[PDB]
């Protein structure tokens, strides 16, 4: 009766993968997608009751991605490949927006988990976790929405795991620490599949038995309301708790309340 749900969020930012292809490195977006598909196939292999969802995080929007091989796995992989092809080929850069919409993808993942939980029969409990692989740099403009998503995930007891590839993200560290998930930075990109199978494949009950890397140094720098940048020391209002980098005689947020 143990139903495990694994929603995998893939950072599909075209600019970062294009730069990676320009670097002519051994790791590309195709290999990352293959590793994600193999991890999902393994998750479905572990038990009948396991459910899988793959969400691709893109600049324009968030896309729900999902011969000797398993029949259900074959259809799932074909659907994932078709969806990722449709997303990438029709992805036209129209605007100066470059930061990935990670917060929206996590919100959609939470909504999908909420939908799945109701459809789960009352005799079974659907344990849900969200795995995020990070490719591009962190986005500071989405601080409030990301924190709201973290709090929503914590309220429903949903694990959030981050698998950072190149550049660390403070928001992902905070999400992993608050929701109880694991934060891991991959040293060798081609070993992404092995890292996922070794670390993020087991469930939280299985994570208790297995010895896993200790949590990384999570930062808690706040975002200034008028600058939206990381700060160490800032002015915080006493009424609305809004954070400001510099002293002001009249709080901007308190202006709303007359």
Partner 1 sequence: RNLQEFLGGLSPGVLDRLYGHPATCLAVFRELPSLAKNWVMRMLFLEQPLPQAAVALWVKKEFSKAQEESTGLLSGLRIWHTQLLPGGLQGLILNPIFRQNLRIALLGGGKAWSDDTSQLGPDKHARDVPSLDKYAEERWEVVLHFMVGSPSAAVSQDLAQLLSQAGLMKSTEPGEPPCITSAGFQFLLLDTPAQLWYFMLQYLQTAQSRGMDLVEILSFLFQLSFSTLGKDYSVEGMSDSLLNFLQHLREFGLVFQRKRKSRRYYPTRLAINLSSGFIVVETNYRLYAYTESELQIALIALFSEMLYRFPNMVVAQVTRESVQQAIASGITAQQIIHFLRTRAHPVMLKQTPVLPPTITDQIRLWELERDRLRFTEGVLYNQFLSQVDFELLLAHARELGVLVFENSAKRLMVVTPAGHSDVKRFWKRQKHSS
Residues in contact with Zn ion by the rule CB under 5 A: 224, 226-227, 237, 239-240, 244-245, 251, 253-254
List, in order, residues 6 or more apart from 56 with CB less than 8 Å away.
Answer: 9, 10, 12, 62, 63, 64, 65, 83, 84, 87, 105
Measured from the CB atom, is 218 or 230 closer to Zn ion?
Answer: 230
Element spanning 175, H or E:
helix 170-179
Of 201 and 251, nearer to partner 1 (C-beta) is 201
Task: Indicate the residue among 15 and 201 with the shorter CB distance to partner 1.
Answer: 201
Map residues 99-138 to x or -, x wherever contact with partner 1 holds by CB under 8 A. Answer: ----------------------xxx---------------
Among partner 1, Zn ion, none, residue 249 binds (CB under 5-8 Å by kind)? none
Q: Give the torsion sign (CA, 204, 209, 213, 219).
A: positive
Output phi, psi for 223, to 5 deg. -105, 125
Dihedral angle over CA of 154, 47, 183, 206, nearest 10: 90
> How many other CB atoms are found less than 10 A from the CB of residue 136?
23
Q: Which of 23, 30, 61, 70 binds partner 1 (CB under 8 A)?
A: 70
Bridge partners of 164, per DSSP, are: 134, 185
Residues 196-215: x where in contact with partner 1 by CB under 8 A, - otherwise, as a string: -xx--xxx-xx-xxxx----
**Residue 26 or 246 having the CB closest to Zn ion:** 246
Of residues 22, 24, 67, 214, which one binds partner 1 by CB under 8 A? Answer: 67
Contact 221/170 with Cβ under 8 angstroms?
yes
Measured from the CB atom, is 72 or 236 closer to partner 1? 72
**Which position among 71, 119, 232, 255 is part of the footprint of partner 1 (CB under 8 A)?**
71
Name which of partner 1, Zn ion, none residue 226 binds, using a CB cut-off of 5 to 8 Å depending on partner kind. Answer: Zn ion
Scanning residues 23 to 42, which ones bind partner 1 (CB under 8 A)? 38, 41-42
Distance CA 72, CA 147 (A): 36
**φ, ψ (nearest 5 deg) of residue 198:** -75, -40
Query: Of 13, 72, 26, 56, which Cα lies nearest the Cα of 192?
Result: 26
Shortest spacing between CB 258 and Zn ion, in angstroms: 13
Q: Shortest distance, CB of residue 47 to partner 1, whole angstroms?
A: 7
- Binding residues (CB under 8 A) for partner 1: these are 38, 41-42, 45-48, 67-74, 121-123, 193-194, 197-198, 201-203, 205-206, 208-211
């Amino acid at each position: 009766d143990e139903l495990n749900l694994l929603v995998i969020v893939v950072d599909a930012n075209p600019i970062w993968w294009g730069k990676q292809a320009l670097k002519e490195s051994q790791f590309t977006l195709s290999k990352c997608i293959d590793a994600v598909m193999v991890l999902g196939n393994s998750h479905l292999f572990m038990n009948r009751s396991n459910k899988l969802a793959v969400i691709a995080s893109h600049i324009q929007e968030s896309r729900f991605l999902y011969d000797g091989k398993y029949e259900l796995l074959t259809s799932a992989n074909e659907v994932i490949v078709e969806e990722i092809k449709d997303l990438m080929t029709k992805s036209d850069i129209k605007g100066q927006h470059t930061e990935t919409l990670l917060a929206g993808s996590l919100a959609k993942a939470l909504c999908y988990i909420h939908r799945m939980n109701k459809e789960v029969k009352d005799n079974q409990e659907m344990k849900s976790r969200i795995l995020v692989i990070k490719a591009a740099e962190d986005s500071a403009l989405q601080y409030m929405n990301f924190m709201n998503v973290i709090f929503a995930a914590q309220k429903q007891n949903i694990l959030i795991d981050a698998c950072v590839l190149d550049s660390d993200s403070g928001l992902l560290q905070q999400a992993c620490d608050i929701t109880g998930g694991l934060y891991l930075k991959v040293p060798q990109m081609p070993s992404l599949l092995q890292y996922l199978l070794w670390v993020f494949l087991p469930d939280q009950d299985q994570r208790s038995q297995l010895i896993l890397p200790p949590p990384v140094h999570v930062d808690y720098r706040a975002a200034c309301f008028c600058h939206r940048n990381l700060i160490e020391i800032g002015y915080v209002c006493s009424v609305c708790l809004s954070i400001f980098c510099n002293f002001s005689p009249i709080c901007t947020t308190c202006e709303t309340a007359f």
